[PDB]
């Protein structure tokens, strides 16, 4: 169907494990959900403009390869996430 099964690379797995359960494979939906929770728990967003995330000083910044991004940049977020996993 439309569901996507994935296997996160080492660093993304570390990211995911800090807020969720360890699994051999995850769905893209699960990954997106956990990343949101990770960003929230670490308060990486701007309190006064919460659709803006600054990740340069965080593991997420190392994974995505950018200092910051807007939650509205869907293509960017999806492509950056795909660059950190393998589709099964």
């Amino acid at each position: 169907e439309q569901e996507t099964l994935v296997r996160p690379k080492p660093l993304l797995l570390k990211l995911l494990k800090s807020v969720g359960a360890q699994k051999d494979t995850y769905t893209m939906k699960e990954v997106l959900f956990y990343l949101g929770q990770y960003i929230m728990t670490k308060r990486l967003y701007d309190e006064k403009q919460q659709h803006i995330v600054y990740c340069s000083n965080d593991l997420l910044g190392d994974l995505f390869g950018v200092p910051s991004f807007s939650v509205k940049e869907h293509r960017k977020i999806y492509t950056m996430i795909y660059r950190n996993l393998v589709v099964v």
């Binding site: 949101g36 960003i39 929230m40 967003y45 919460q50 659709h51 939650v71 869907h74 977020i77």
Partner: peptide, 9 residues
Amino acid sequence: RFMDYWEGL
């Protein structure tokens, strides 16, 4: 409201 925006992905 971060979640409101994140829900859009």
